[PDB]
Amino acid sequence: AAKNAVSQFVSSMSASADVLAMSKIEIKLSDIPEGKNMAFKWRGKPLFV
Amino acid sequence: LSRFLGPRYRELARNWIPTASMWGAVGAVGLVWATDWRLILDWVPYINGKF
Amino acid sequence: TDLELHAPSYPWSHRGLLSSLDHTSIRRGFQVYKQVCSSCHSMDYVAYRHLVGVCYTEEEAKALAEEVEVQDGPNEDGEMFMRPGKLSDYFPKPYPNPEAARAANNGALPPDLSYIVRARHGGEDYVFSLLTGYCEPPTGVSLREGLYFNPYFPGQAIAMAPPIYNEVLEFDDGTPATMSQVAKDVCTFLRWASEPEHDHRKRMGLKMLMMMGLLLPLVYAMKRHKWSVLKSRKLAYRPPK
Amino acid sequence: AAPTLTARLYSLLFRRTSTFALTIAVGALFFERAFDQGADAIYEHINQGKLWKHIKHKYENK
Amino acid sequence: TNIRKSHPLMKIINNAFIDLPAPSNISSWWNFGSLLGICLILQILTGLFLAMHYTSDTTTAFSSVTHICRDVNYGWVIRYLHANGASMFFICLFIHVGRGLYYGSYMFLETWNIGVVLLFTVMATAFMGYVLPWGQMSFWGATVITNLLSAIPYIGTDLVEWIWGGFSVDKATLTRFFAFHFILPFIITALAAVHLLFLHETGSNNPTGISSDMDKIPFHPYYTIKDILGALFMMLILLILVLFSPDLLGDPDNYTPANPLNTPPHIKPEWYFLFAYAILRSIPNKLGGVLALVASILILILMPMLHTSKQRSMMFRPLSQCLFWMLVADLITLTWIGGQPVEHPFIIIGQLASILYFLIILVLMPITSIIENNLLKW
Amino acid sequence: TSDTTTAFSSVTHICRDVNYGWVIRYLHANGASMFFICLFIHVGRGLYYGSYMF
Amino acid sequence: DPLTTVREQCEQIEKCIKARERLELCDQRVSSRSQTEEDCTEELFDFLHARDHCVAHKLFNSLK
Amino acid sequence: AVAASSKWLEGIRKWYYNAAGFNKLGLMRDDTIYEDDDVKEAIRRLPENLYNDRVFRIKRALDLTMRQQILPKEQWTKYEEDKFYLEPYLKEVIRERKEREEWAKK
Amino acid sequence: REFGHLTRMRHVITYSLSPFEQRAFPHYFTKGIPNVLRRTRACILRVAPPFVVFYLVYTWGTQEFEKSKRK
Ligand code: HEC
Ligand code: HEM
Ligand code: HEM
């Protein structure tokens, strides 16, 4: 009985945090132009493509 | 040291290495369940608690 | 591996201990920013509600809100119209977005001017020594098409073009508008913007050195007259012979 | 025997706790107005001019 | 009858500080425990308004701080209390811990071990706090340490994703760091009523070593009016520093606004972690470095079991007096070195200085105490 | 968020947006409809078994 | 303008002439051959530091 | 272990006696030891004239320290007039403890 | 562990005096000043030598870093 009630609390505030879905699975295909390294506010640290 | 040197403390040690061994085994296995430790949760495929 | 020059120390009228900021170099310093610096730099944290009692009277700076009218947002059926502006409104920002700056200014985003004082080693004497410095390139150093030489700047080559010289501005008073005094009255305006607290707190540090003074040798007296019983006791030991 | 300042001071208002407690309340009241006035004045005189008051006479009564 | 004695509630405060035996010759170096008690208590009342008006969001992270300074009534006063009342807290704590060692105070097994747990707990609270303001040093400490706990042999990879609550620092960051930096104070006011309950059964020590039951003295009024004088003298120093020269201690790199892109030129921490940073940087490789940084807090525990002496404390011991001062002089050479680049000549002194922190404790104080025993025949 | 024009949308995003938040919102709203159940029983009994002489 | 008058007044003291003497010696050697390495930024740095140190005591007096 | 150097061991022992400073408070070497469970036993095996003295040399030299002073120079405990009063009662509490412990071993 | 149960003690006497019958500063500048003297004297022969060393290394290290860039 004491298993689920803690397995759920472990993931409530974590496990992609529920705000991480958008650009790891995102469909942008390099909004950055050719030859430049533009920074995106995704992946926590800026994403570069 | 010398207060603890003897055969009787070594005998208690070999008598209660069952206690230490079971204590450590239970603690180690419990430390897998407690922190959602997938890395040993997979060493046995019998606990499919990850949904 | 290049060395950096450190600005010296000057005798400001607000330098230490108990001395304040004279509100005339600041009254004469917004204008030097207003008619020179602003069309590129932002002052977003700084708003017109602030200057009601430091440099200008309430309506005197109110009239500076009508000089430029800011673009507005959503209102009824004809939004994106223009409003004359009032007391609340902030220092109008030059571009639509900051990303326009790299377009016109060679890919060099201008630093904001709200904290430029505190964010630098040196302080209000690094900026002043920057302004009058601009010098000659020595023998044997190449530069880009759009770069300038300054022995204070860490790279020794800055995009910005010297914005102060003789007869740049007309002071409303008639003091000789010279490079030497325009630079000083800019280094005074920005400092007060970095802190609006620099003068209120020099006055709570003098009325407190007096409460401590009165109360910190009266607790010492009580303490001393409980430990005298304890500090003047003699003692025996005659044992049985 | 000669009347010391504290000799008649201890008799009148220092005995029980009661007048020992009245004066502590009243003592601060006759103290805060004197202490407030003579503290700001030195702030002005040390560096007068520079402040905003000593120039705003340029804008008064037209 | 006597009310205090017979009431069920007053009966408890009467045995704790009104009426307990206390030694006659207690000095002023015994005043710091109560200062810490005072010091801990400011930080919770301050830190209340810094979340009440505080906003937990990623986009406003830099801007929430500069906002609260000017707009909020009496906000410029209270903000610099939280940052300056926490550099006080760490100078009444290296004085307290140092004092006990000199006078042999670690022979309380119960209380010298509940105290080394309190020393890890307040290190953590401080190190989240630097990382809330977000500006171009909070971010560039966070990467350094957070990355390096990824060199754990089998678990390090799995941990940096949980604390991030994402790939990396993200909006969730305000949610967690605030969450764990908020929690920490309230576990520390619990291990302090237990740190003191194990001491009410032996009483205090005194700067002589010998045990003194033939002249005790109550605790009132003799150390409840020496403790007040102490605390007042302290409000005086804490207030010279925020109404005259607040900015003397920080670094002018913090302000530069929130940018992932920009490069901080000269990374380095706040002044009371600069002896930790000089250890980690002194040794090649990822895995051996983290082990040399936990070693020091963990070394205090080997304390009572290295004691070789007939006397307790260093008061009557000349030879062992001198070393004391060496360990201290050599913890001032790890604060200067750690706030600079690796350097051409700063690597050789820089990692000679560190081992010695280790050599004296583990080899030279046990040996030297024996020559004292042998030299006056025990 | 104690924003007078941000407060209501806050609970509206929590009871949609995050993992298991719909459970926790309702335990907090219902677990005090019963803490107030307990009170009326623990009190009324002390007016049966003479429990005020304490 | 008042700065323009004082700079040469403050260059008069011999604390700043010596480093000035040093600047020319390498300056002509560098320009004599395009094969030299030194860039006189260093010898420049001594001269400005000494000059601008002595300007500080006075310029605020000789203002308005 | 040395004989011709035993003059030097005496020389270093008279210097370390003065550098440590319990004689300026009147104490004696046995007054300073640390009281554990084995020194707490050997104290209640003392006659009464020896035990009463020890409680006055420890109360007069813990009052001079509350006042941050030291006793006049004519009353300093000399080197060749310190008598080890608690030594013999302490070798005996110890060697009776090595005996109760090698019985549990054999 | 209260006052009536701590130790046993014999033939000794004490001679206190009131607080309202005496003075708090008998001799303030004639005793305190020679006092601080013997104190510090006796002890600043084993507290200073360690801190001279940190000064010698400090001046040797900034000297080297400076002359490796500025020739
Ligand atoms: C649009 C032209 C322009 C003018 C005219 C102008 N600024 Fe600048 N300002 C800039 C740019 C561009 C930079 C630096 C951007 C960079 O180096 O990336 C800058 C930098 C600065 C700096 C910091 C200098 C440094 O070294 O970091 C200050 C302060 C400043 N501006 C304020 C002013 C002041 C004061 C004036 C009037 C003397 C002024 N601006 C006039 C665009 C301008
Ligand atoms: C030993 C106790 C504490 C220490 C040492 C400590 C330390 C710090 C430090 C060093 C900062 C850096 C911020 C700056 O530089 O201005 C900070 C920020 C902060 N602290 Fe604490 N703190 C303590 C207790 C608390 C408590 C109890 C709270 C309760 C809410 C709290 C809440 C905050 C908050 C909200 C910030 C926000 C960052 C900012 O506003 O600058 N702290 N703390
Ligand atoms: C929040 C942190 C702490 C608080 C509030 C605290 C508080 C106190 C207080 C109030 C005392 C009362 C006795 C006195 O004032 O001398 C005391 C004693 C003591 N403390 Fe702490 N302390 C803290 C941290 C530590 C740490 C880190 C240690 C590390 C070893 C420690 C070890 C001791 C010891 C050994 C004593 C024994 C007193 C003696 O020698 O007589 N404490 N402490």
Å from CA of E61 to ligand 1 middle: 26
Given a contact cutoff of 8 angstroms between Cβ atoms, the answer to whether E25 and E68 are in contact is no
Query: CA–CA separation, G3 vs C179, rounded Å?
Result: 9
Q: Do E236 and C212 make contact, defined as CB atoms within 8 angstroms?
A: yes
- Contacts with C237 (C-beta within 8 Å, 6 or more apart), sequence order: H56, I11, I12, I13
DSSP notation for A7-49: HHHHHHT-SSTTT-HHHHS---S--S-TT----BS-SSSPB--
Do chains E and I touch by CB distance (3+ pairs < 8 Å)?
yes
Length of chain B in terms of residues written: 51
User: What is the CB neighbour count within 10 angstroms for residue C189?
Assistant: 21
> Which pair of tokens denotes residue E75?
């906000």
Measured N-to-C along each axis, helices E138-148 and E109-130 cross at an angle, to the nearest 10 degrees, of 130
Helices (H), chain E: 3-6, 10-13, 32-52, 61-70, 75-88, 94-102, 109-130, 138-148, 156-164, 172-183, 185-188, 226-243, 276-280, 286-299, 318-329, 333-336, 346-359, 365-375
- Pick among H46, H68, H71, H73 to test the I interface (most I CBs inside 10 A): H68
> Which pair of tokens denotes residue C84?
């004359």
Query: CA–CA separation, C130 vs C162, rounded Å?
Result: 10
> Which pair of tokens denotes residue E137?
């040093």
Beta strands in E200-261, from DSSP E residues, in sequence order: 216-217
Query: CA–CA separation, H80 vs H78, rounded Å?
Result: 6
User: What is the CB neighbour count within 10 angstroms for residue F36?
Assistant: 8
Query: CA–CA separation, E78 vs E76, rounded Å?
Result: 6
Query: CA–CA separation, E277 vs E274, rounded Å?
Result: 5
Given a contact cutoff of 8 angstroms between Cβ atoms, the answer to whether E216 and E97 are in contact is no
* Main-chain dihedrals φ then ψ at residue E32, nearest 5 degrees: -70, -20
Q: Do C197 and E76 make contact, defined as CB atoms within 8 angstroms?
A: yes
I residues 27-56 closer than 8 Å to H (CB): 35, 39
Query: CA–CA separation, C173 vs G2, rounded Å?
Result: 19
Q: Which residue has the tokens 């990692």?
A: E351
- Contacts with B21 (C-beta within 8 Å, 6 or more apart), sequence order: none
Binding residue numbers of C: 37, 40-41, 120, 126, 159-160
Given a contact cutoff of 8 angstroms between Cβ atoms, the answer to whether A43 and A23 are in contact is yes
Q: Which residues pair with A47 in a beta bridge?
A: A40
Q: Which residues pair with C44 in a beta bridge?
A: none
Furthest-apart CA pair in chain B: how many Å? 56
Query: CA–CA separation, D46 vs C20, rounded Å?
Result: 10
User: What is the CB neighbour count within 10 angstroms for residue I34?
Assistant: 10
**List of chains touching D (3+ CB pairs within 8 A):** C
Nearest to I53 by CA among E349, E314, E318, E278: E349
> Which pair of tokens denotes residue E306?
């290295």
Q: What residues of E act catalytically?
A: 200, 204, 226-227, 270
- Residue C29: in which H helix or E strand, if any? none
Q: Kindly state whether E322 is in contact with chain I, defined as any CB-CB distance less than 8 angstroms.
A: yes
> Could you give the 3-state DSSP secondary structure of residue C157?
strand
Q: After which residues is chain A broken (C to N over 2.5 A)?
A: none
- Burial group, residue C214, by CB count within 10 angstroms (0-12, 13-18, 19+): exposed
> Could you give the 3-state DSSP secondary structure of residue I14?
strand
> Which pair of tokens denotes residue E44?
């919770």
Sign, CA torsion E127/E132/E134/E135? negative
Given a contact cutoff of 8 angstroms between Cβ atoms, the answer to whether C156 and C130 are in contact is no
Query: CA–CA separation, G17 vs G47, rounded Å?
Result: 8
Query: CA–CA separation, F48 vs E62, rounded Å?
Result: 61
Given a contact cutoff of 8 angstroms between Cβ atoms, the answer to whether E132 and E177 are in contact is yes
Alpha carbon of residue D23 to chain centroid: 16
- Contacts with E378 (C-beta within 8 Å, 6 or more apart), sequence order: E310
Query: CA–CA separation, C181 vs C9, rounded Å?
Result: 17
Q: How far is C179 from chain G (nearest CA, A)?
A: 7
Given a contact cutoff of 8 angstroms between Cβ atoms, the answer to whether H89 and H95 are in contact is no
Given a contact cutoff of 8 angstroms between Cβ atoms, the answer to whether E85 and E46 are in contact is yes
CA angle G20-G25-G26, nearest 5°? Answer: 105
Query: CA–CA separation, A37 vs E228, rounded Å?
Result: 61
Given a contact cutoff of 8 angstroms between Cβ atoms, the answer to whether C164 and C183 are in contact is yes
* Main-chain dihedrals φ then ψ at residue C148, nearest 5 degrees: -125, 155
Helices (H), G1-64: 2-10, 17-32, 41-55
Experimental approach taken:
cryo-EM
Q: How far is CA C33 from CA C26, C38, E257, in A?
A: 11, 6, 22
DSSP notation for E39-83: HHHHHHHHHHHHHHS----STTHHHHHHHHHHSSTTHHHHHHHHH
Sign, CA torsion F13/F14/F15/F17? positive
Query: CA–CA separation, E11 vs E13, rounded Å?
Result: 6
Query: CA–CA separation, G60 vs G58, rounded Å?
Result: 6
Å from CA of E34 to ligand 3 middle: 9
For ligand 2, whether the C-beta of E126 sits within 6 Å is yes
Nearest to H60 by CA among H71, H76, H74: H71
Pairing of strands E216-217, C157-158: unpaired
Given a contact cutoff of 8 angstroms between Cβ atoms, the answer to whether E180 and E93 are in contact is no
Q: How far is CA H78 from CA D58, E80, H33, H56, I42, in A?
A: 87, 59, 19, 18, 20
> Which pair of tokens denotes residue E356?
């010695």
Q: How far is CA C160 from CA C40, C109, C137, E118, in A?
A: 11, 11, 16, 53
Nearest to C56 by CA among C85, C93, C35, C87: C87
CA angle C214-C220-C222, nearest 5°? Answer: 105
> Which pair of tokens denotes residue F33?
């409809």
Tell me, what amino acid is at C135? C
- Contacts with I28 (C-beta within 8 Å, 6 or more apart), sequence order: none
Q: Which residue has the tokens 């909004």?
A: A31
Q: Do C230 and E226 make contact, defined as CB atoms within 8 angstroms?
A: no
Nearest to H57 by CA among H25, H85, H16: H25
Q: How far is CA F3 from CA C39, E54, E63, in A?
A: 34, 11, 16
Given a contact cutoff of 8 angstroms between Cβ atoms, the answer to whether E51 and E132 are in contact is no
Query: CA–CA separation, A18 vs E137, rounded Å?
Result: 28
User: What is the CB neighbour count within 10 angstroms for residue E284?
Assistant: 6
Q: Kindly state whether C235 is in contact with chain I, defined as any CB-CB distance less than 8 angstroms.
A: yes
Given a contact cutoff of 8 angstroms between Cβ atoms, the answer to whether G46 and G16 are in contact is no
Tell me, what amino acid is at G21? E
Å from CA of I6 to ligand 3 middle: 25
Given a contact cutoff of 8 angstroms between Cβ atoms, the answer to whether C196 and E69 are in contact is no
- Burial group, residue E205, by CB count within 10 angstroms (0-12, 13-18, 19+): buried
Given a contact cutoff of 8 angstroms between Cβ atoms, the answer to whether C80 and C70 are in contact is no
Query: CA–CA separation, E44 vs H27, rounded Å?
Result: 49
Query: CA–CA separation, C169 vs C178, rounded Å?
Result: 8
DSSP notation for H6-74: HHHHHHHHHHHHHHS-SGGGT--GGGS----TTTTTTTTTS-HHHHHHHHHHTTSTTTTTTTT----GG
Given a contact cutoff of 8 angstroms between Cβ atoms, the answer to whether E149 and E271 are in contact is no
For ligand 1, whether the C-beta of C105 sits within 6 Å is yes
- Residue whose Cα lies nearest atom 11 of ligand 1: it is C110
Beta strands in C20-114, from DSSP E residues, in sequence order: none
